[PDB]
Write a protein that binds this ligand. Structure first.
Ligand SMILES: Nc1ncnc2c1ncn2[C@@H]1O[C@H](COP(=O)(O)OP(=O)(O)OC[C@H]2O[C@@H](O)[C@H](O)[C@@H]2O)[C@@H](O)[C@H]1O
Ligand SMILES: Nc1ncnc2c1ncn2[C@@H]1O[C@H](COP(=O)(O)OP(=O)(O)OC[C@H]2O[C@@H](O)[C@H](O)[C@@H]2O)[C@@H](O)[C@H]1O
Ligand SMILES: Nc1ncnc2c1ncn2[C@@H]1O[C@H](COP(=O)(O)OP(=O)(O)OC[C@H]2O[C@@H](O)[C@H](O)[C@@H]2O)[C@@H](O)[C@H]1O
Ligand SMILES: [Cl-]
Ligand SMILES: [Cl-]
Ligand SMILES: [Cl-]
Ligand SMILES: [Cl-]
Ligand SMILES: [Zn+2]
Ligand SMILES: [Zn+2]
Ligand SMILES: [Zn+2]
Lengths: 294, 290, 295
């Protein structure tokens, strides 16, 4: 048997967890899956996460001589001193890296029509570079598609700011030609509001989920410490009747605070988790193809 | 009163003192225990999840695909040997009850035991003298066997004798549906015994009806459901006790003001609780008798 | 910096102390409530109660008690007061000087920015630092006077204190109107806290509720306490969600470890260091050093 009241353990090995997830999907064909990801799914691509000990970005910014680590991405600090961010802005642009196996899994799930959405906090855009349709990607923390004035919010093309970085001697910084305030790429900083698409789309997918509880859906959170708001408030807003999966090196956020009987916590690396899920779903072939094509 | 200076994080000595006090104030009140592997560690049976020593961390000679494969119904169905191989050591018999098990017997004698919900299959509470009507084996036992297919029940001996056979030839099958037959102990994926959900359903009301009760949880990491849901389902108006080496489950998440948490080994806990209750005599006699 | 903007729950210390000072700057004239425990007097040379090895409860072996907290339990006291008497001698205030954190409360007072200080200490150190009695709530009593554990009659201190000098302390002080034992008004487990505690909090809670038009936004700061004792430990949880909480302690505890609110500002610093750092971020280094020197 495998009823909702059958013996089970929340934290399980990758092998068992993937069997549970695979079983659910086979039992709920047509159902979709909502993913919520963070810097974790990009470490293997060569991009260190933010808060992991020793290797985290917030542990390798001594060069910037900042008052505190997170200052590089805080508007308050940006207004009073943009040199540091400019100095780091370079490496932040997409391009230098290739998607990971986990990023491609989202693509696979799309090709199999089981991806409902991907709320990401990353700005490396690897989820799109992997094949996922914009319609399905919710870049919760903005991106470099454009820039904006931190004063009135005027929107500008990338090129201008991207230019100022080139020139070594960082002269006066890009100002807003209409209010005179500082202009920067549209990646959310501490202090700023997230884009509209984020809270609006979530508002839609939340009713979608409530509608389903039909072929039951799943929500899978991976590679994030759920330490940043308002993004970290999503997992707890998932209806209790909707199964939640957490594939992370460590149990965090709502999974740690208010673990539910039906929760699935998997302490695994996103790529290993991705590999094992594909096999069990029986989608090795299609996945292999998607991987070789890139 | 109730809104006076009180702890929520006291020392072991004080906590034991308060538990005993509670019982003395409510002489007719009974207790409900909720136990796990932790109470049979001293008997020589290591628990399941403790770092390094835990059973799941020592299944190497069984060459499993993953730790919980042995007690997973899906793996068993497609490959029963590892369980057959491990089932030999799991059969009750080779051990004797711990001082804590006898504390259960002691409470029974004193008409203070309402129920004992256990997740152990070692049957040590039974071997300690606790009446069957007061014991609830939430995770089953080796008392009988059953078919993983149609649920039909059979006696123990056929499966137990097959274990004696060295190269386990053909595995026991159900003579009606042909599916595999195994001891009636709960595996991952399997539903629990009716007595569990049904007795709790009942005992729950008994509690809400008596609001003076006490529910003591000991020796379990509360990682396995639906058993793990038991603690939080205790009425807020009921005093909960947790005797475990580490704060776990609903005691760690939604801690309650009146919650007593004792970080102690169950045997010492019992040895000490017996002291504060002033029952040193009968207890020592029971330890001798059995 | 809207109510739904991007923020970190696990901010570093620098950012945390930064956010606090900023909140006060963008909310001048708003007051702050302090909730404190043994932690803030530790640097003064007064051990707290539960710190591994050094806490008081780990050092009463000589008193041969059934349990540590027994010296401060009415049930045990009512049956055997000798242990407390034996200890009581060294509990009386007056042998220590306030800590920098303590003077930090005074500073906050001078700036007319201190609403109240709920304290579980009985060292009277917030008072010795200059905090007005009306702004101080001693949730766990004091040695100001004594009382009968039976009828509750109040008595002057001296009668109980002199009784402590007598080499072989015998015939313990008793209520001359009911016969029960008398002791200094410091709260023991089993006893009801002083009336003003629950009542002042009843008002301060309404004050908080009425600050959330647009009144300057308050702030509740808890520091130096493990939140192991009720009803005090219920205060930080009874704080309205729309009011920021700050926890300055060596470790996260109470409602901060349990139901941590996104907005909570957790800081693992020694209370004295927290004071110095907060004073700097506030630009009050001058008014502080003068208060410190003038002591
Ligand atoms: N290969 C991996 N597989 C799975 N999890 C991983 C892996 N590598 C690291 N992790 C886990 O992923 C998490 C990474 O956490 P963070 O650094 O905090 O990243 P993220 O949560 O997305 O950070 C949120 C946000 O904070 C801002 O600083 C920034 O703006 C960003 O979007 C950690 O909990 C870590 O253990
Ligand atoms: N002497 C002791 N006294 C008190 N607590 C103890 C003692 N020894 C160990 N413990 C604690 O008891 C708990 C035992 O945890 P588990 O291994 O997880 O055991 P238990 O919860 O009962 O496991 C539940 C179930 O999981 C299945 O695998 C199995 O089927 C079983 O019934 C741990 O948190 C451990 O620290
Ligand atoms: N310099 C310091 N700065 C910050 N925190 C400190 C410092 N020194 C100790 N601490 C922390 O302060 C807390 C002290 O906790 P307690 O001993 O429990 O003290 P307190 O909470 O006030 O105890 C409450 C009450 O319990 C009774 O026993 C007694 O009556 C008392 O008022 C601990 O969490 C400890 O790590
Ligand atoms: Cl759909
Ligand atoms: Cl819900
Ligand atoms: Cl209830
Ligand atoms: Cl509220
Ligand atoms: Zn502008
Ligand atoms: Zn059958
Ligand atoms: Zn009296």
């Amino acid at each position: 048997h495998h009823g909702m009241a059958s013996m089970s353990v929340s934290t399980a090995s990758t092998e068992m967890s993937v069997r549970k997830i695979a079983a659910h999907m086979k039992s709920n064909p047509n159902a979709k899956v909502i993913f919520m990801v963070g810097a974790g799914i990009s470490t293997s691509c060569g991009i260190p996460d933010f808060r992991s000990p020793g290797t985290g970005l917030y542990h390798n910014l001594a060069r910037l001589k900042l008052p505190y680590p997170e200052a590089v991405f805080d508007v308050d600090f940006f207004q009073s001193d943009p040199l540091p961010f400019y100095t780091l802005a370079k490496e932040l642009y997409p391009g230098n890296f290739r998607p990971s196996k986990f990023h491609y899994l989202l693509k696979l799930f799309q090709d199999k029509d089981v991806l409902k959405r991907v709320y990401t906090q990353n700005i490396d855009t690897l989820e799109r570079q992997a094949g996922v349709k914009d319609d399905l990607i919710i870049e919760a923390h903005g991106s470099f598609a454009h820039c904006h004035c931190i004063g009135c919010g005027k929107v500008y093309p990338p090129q201008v700011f991207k230019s100022k970085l080139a020139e070594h001697p960082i002269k006066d910084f890009v100002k807003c030609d209409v209010c005179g305030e500082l202009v920067k790429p549209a990646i959310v900083f501490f202090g700023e509001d997230l884009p509209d698409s984020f809270s609006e789309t979530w508002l839609n997918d939340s009713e979608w989920l409530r509608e389903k509880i039909p072929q039951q859906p799943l929500v899978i959170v991976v590679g994030t410490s759920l330490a940043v708001y308002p993004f970290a408030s999503l997992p707890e807003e998932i209806p209790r009747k909707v199964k939640r999966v957490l594939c992370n090196l460590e149990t965090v956020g709502d999974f740690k605070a208010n673990k539910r009987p039906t929760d699935l916590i998997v302490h695994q690396y996103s790529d290993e988790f991705a590999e094992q899920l594909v096999e069990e779903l029986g989608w090795q072939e299609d996945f292999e193809k998607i991987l070789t094509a890139q």
